[PDB]
Amino acid sequence: VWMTQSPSLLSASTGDRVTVSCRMSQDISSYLAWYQQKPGKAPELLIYAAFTLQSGVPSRFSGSGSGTEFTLTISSLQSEDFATYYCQQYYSFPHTFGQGTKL
Amino acid sequence: YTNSFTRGVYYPDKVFRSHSTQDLFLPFFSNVTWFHNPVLPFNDGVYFASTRGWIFGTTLDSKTQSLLIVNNATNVVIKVCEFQYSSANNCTFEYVSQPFLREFVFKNIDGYFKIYSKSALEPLVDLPIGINITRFQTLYYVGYLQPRTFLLKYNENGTITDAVD
Amino acid sequence: VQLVESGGGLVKPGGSLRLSCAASGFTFSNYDMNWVRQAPGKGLEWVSSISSSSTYTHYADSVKGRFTISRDNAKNSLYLQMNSLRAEDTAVYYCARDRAYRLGELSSLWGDDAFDIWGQGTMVT
Amino acid sequence: NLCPFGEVFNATRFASVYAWNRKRISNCVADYSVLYNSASFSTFKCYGVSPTKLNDLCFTNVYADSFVIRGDEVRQIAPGQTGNIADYNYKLPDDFTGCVIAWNSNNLDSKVGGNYNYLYRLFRKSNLKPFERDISTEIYQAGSTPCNGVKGFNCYFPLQSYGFQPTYGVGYQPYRVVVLSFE
Ligand SMILES: *[C@@H]1O[C@H](CO)[C@@H](O[C@@H]2O[C@H](CO)[C@@H](O[C@@H]3O[C@H](CO)[C@@H](O)[C@H](O)[C@@H]3O)[C@H](O)[C@H]2NC(C)=O)[C@H](O)[C@H]1NC(C)=O
């Protein structure tokens, strides 16, 4: 299994509907997570199992798609939501992370 | 162009020996699209006749599986892969056998793929492909099958001769 | 549920260092633990893993056969023995916990969590 | 030439209900002795074929499906049944000819804190045809105004998590279901 996001520099204005895709190789059903790492800080847990929301995050963050495709949709970009977003599968036991999406 | 015919009856998908059947058939005096290679739609079944291959699939892209039939000078190859062949990947089924007025009848039902050739087009091969097909292209007269019941008069050794709408 | 780390720092190539990842308020002794690193200006790459019972351990591919992971449930501490280092390994290392339990430490059934809480990192050179 | 029945029942993990796995079985010799003669099967009940008569027959195709459901929803995996899972997730034809197998898997599929990797479909426009599944996760439209992909008033997410923990009773404990079919 090899991870593949295909944004690499996507940047928008203050308030939009961006969609970061995450292509894969095999079928893992719903075993994919999402992260958000601000500069110079440890990553914070974001949507996990591709459909659940970690307690504390607002509802503007969503996770959709199934099979070998997964997308994270932001309802409205704000000043807080400007960082990188990674993928992580845990089907087999190499844990292949993503590449990075700088908003 | 268009043309009209009187042929296209095949053994109703079952292998008993000998009657009226209600299956997918071809109306007798129908309009056949005379041709001389556009990507035609599949509908439910096509009556293909000619006087050296076909591409079966939904999108003809790597997104969905597409079936491919090709005949060499001495061999026939059947593969259903994620074609674009520019790029062949993955896929589960490969078939090899002796290579196929040549006329055919293709139908896709119950996840099975059935081919008839030669009227009384005899069964040729059955494939458990298990994919959906909605469109095709020819690498000849093309008809379209319809669900109309026929009456088939066998000739005491099979060999269907006469059919009644 | 506050993870703190120590160790690492300046080291000569080919040397050996041992890191520490301590638990400060949860039931670490029956949670799993995982190690994730990132290079300066790069993404995250998986490194190591360990079960709660210390019976099953999985390592990465580019570092296979050179790292050793160990834990102590008595003092709630976690270690990673690294030796024969290169210039590639110079990076920041985080120790990552796991979201949920599993009573049965069964083969090929553990470590399917999503790294619920992380650490603050170090400056391994 | 033994069948891969051992692999289907002893798979490392089973897919969710809305994305049930389907495997084709053909050109093999099947042994049903180990299935019926096992006490681990909580429910071995089926329709149209007696379990003792299974080994004395021949079939042209064998289809095996698998998913994970709650304990109380096992009765819903049966022909001519109405409910949440039958109408929205997995529907069988009335003239079904195959054997349904289910058993408890609390020690495996349930973890403390919630195993949120198991899902089910809850909203749809219409009921499902037999042996038909849709993995589409588009946002559901329940009101008059189009949702346009934002959750809110009458725009709920069509999927929900079971969230297994070993604290619930037998009613909510995870069950693994295998639905064989013959034709
Ligand atoms: C068809 O099967 C292949 C193999 O399982 C899968 O897709 C391809 O998988 C190979 C893995 O051997 C990928 O190649 C890899 O690329 C990375 C890129 O860094 C490289 O480091 C690895 O050493 C390896 O060569 C390949 O990219 C991948 N291609 C695609 C299009 O996915 C997959 O199971 C099937 N492909 C489908 C369904 O499209």
Residue numbers in the entry:
A (entry chain L): 2 to 104
B (entry chain N): 28 to 45, 49 to 66, 81 to 95, 102 to 134, 160 to 175, 189 to 206, 221 to 241, 265 to 290
C (entry chain H): 2 to 126
D (entry chain R): 334 to 516
Give the exact sentences the study uses for this entry.
The SARS-CoV-2 spike protein recognizes the host angiotensin-converting enzyme 2 (ACE2) via its receptor-binding domain (RBD) to mediate viral entry into the cells. In addition, B.1.351 and P.1 carry the K417N/E484K and K417T/E484K substitutions, respectively, which drastically alter RBD surface electrostatics and lead to immune escapes. We also solved the cryo-EM structures of two binary complexes: BD-667/S6P(B.1.351) and BD-804/S6P(B.1.351). Together, these cryo-EM structures provide detailed structural information for eight SARS-CoV-2 B.1.351 neutralizing antibodies. Structural analyses suggest that five of them directly antagonize the binding of ACE2, whereas the neutralization mechanisms of the other three do not depend on ACE2 blocking.
We also characterized two other mAbs that do not compete with ACE2: BD-667 and BD-804. BD-804, on the other hand, targets the upper chest of RBD, and its epitope is fully exposed irrespective of the ‘up’ or ‘down’ states of RBD. RBD residues that BD-804 recognizes include Thr345, Arg346, Tyr351, Leu441, Lys444, Val445, Tyr449, Asn450, Leu452, Thr470, Gly482, Lys484, and Phe490. The light chain of BD-804 contributes more than its heavy chain to interact with RBD, burying 660 Å2 RBD surface compared to 459 Å2 buried by VH. Furthermore, the VL domain also uniquely interacts with a glycan moiety attached on Asn165 in an adjacent NTD to gain additional binding strength. Similar to BD-744, the epitopes of both BD-667 and BD-804 involve Leu452; and the B.1.617.1 and B.1.617.2 variants showed substantial escapes from these mAbs. Obviously, the L452R mutation would nullify the neutralization effect of many mAbs that target the RBD front chest.
